[PDB]
Amino acid sequence: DSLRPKLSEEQQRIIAILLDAHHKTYDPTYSDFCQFRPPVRVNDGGGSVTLELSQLSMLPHLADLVSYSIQKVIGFAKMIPGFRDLTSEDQIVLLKSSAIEVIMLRSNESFTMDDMSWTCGNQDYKYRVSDVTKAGHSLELIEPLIKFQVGLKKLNLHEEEHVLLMAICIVSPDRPGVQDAALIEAIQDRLSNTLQTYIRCRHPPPGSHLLYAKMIQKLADLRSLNEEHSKQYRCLSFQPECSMKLTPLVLEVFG
Numbered sequence: 001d002s003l004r005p006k007l008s009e010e011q012q013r014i015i016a017i018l019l020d021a022h023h024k025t026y027d028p029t030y031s032d033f034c035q036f037r038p039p040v041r042v043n044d045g046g047g048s049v050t051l052e053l054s055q056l057s058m059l060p061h062l063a064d065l066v067s068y069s070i071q072k073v074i075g076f077a078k079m080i081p082g083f084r085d086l087t088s089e090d091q092i093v094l095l096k097s098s099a100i101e102v103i104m105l106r107s108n109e110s111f112t113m114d115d116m117s118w119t120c121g122n123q124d125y126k127y128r129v130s131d132v133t134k135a136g137h138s139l140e141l142i143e144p145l146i147k148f149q150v151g152l153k154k155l156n157l158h159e160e161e162h163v164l165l166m167a168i169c170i171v172s173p174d175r176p177g178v179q180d181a182a183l184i185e186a187i188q189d190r191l192s193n194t195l196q197t198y199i200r201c202r203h204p205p206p207g208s209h210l211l212y213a214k215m216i217q218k219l220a221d222l223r224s225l226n227e228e229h230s231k232q233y234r235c236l237s238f239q240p241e242c243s244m245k246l247t248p249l250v251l252e253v254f255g
């Protein structure tokens, strides 16, 4: 019974714009990573919280990585059809509230189920759960984060669907502090309708089965991950001298 209306001219343009935006802001060779402060991995087979906090050995590198990624996400967002129709104030609210979520989403591209790592090149830029603990985070974030990465991987999203999901994540009307919720909702609805239409006419079975609902659930998962990251960042920031291991951008977004 289900009808399959064709993608409109505008919806095709929206998809093209978002793919272009992503290609301009996501380097799939990770060739800039050598510019970050170097990764350091202390001997911590026992997973000692005291040692992890004393050294924070992976923090400078991972802070630089996240800071770089926030810059790329700002660039991506500015290319989302309609985003620049929002007031500057709403733009900043949306960016600061979604940054960590979009980072988790976009990182799925480097994540591999081969060995459950984010593989961004050689030994040095292969990131494991043990690197996250070396940046001062705990299992309560790490466990659901890995589960999220695998769940997302198993959806086998088209790149078209991946970029739409990132856009929908950013343009969310229910974020605290937004002023024009109605306009944000209108922009999101345009993107949501594009995604729904794409899945129903371009995604082959059986991977398309209830796919939109699964993608919506992943957005809810990201909210939970956002909250847990914020909680853990707060405690991490109590460590004397932590600020110098971060960046001004990271300090603003998460502080």
Ligand SMILES: C=C1/C(=C\C=C2/CCC[C@@]3(C)[C@H]2CC[C@@H]3[C@]2(C)C[C@H](CC(C)(C)O)CO2)C[C@@H](O)[C@H](C)[C@@H]1O
Pocket: 059, 062, 063, 065, 066, 069, 103, 104, 106, 107, 108, 109, 110, 111, 118, 120, 127, 132, 135, 137, 233, 250
């Ligand atoms: C950040 C990106 C990449 C990997 C992402 C990773 C791999 C390393 C660990 C990351 C950055 C995790 C996402 C969240 C996770 C995190 C929980 C975020 C946390 C950041 C701090 C500031 C310490 O709280 C440290 O670990 C690599 C690549 O896919 C992109 C550049 C992408 O934007």
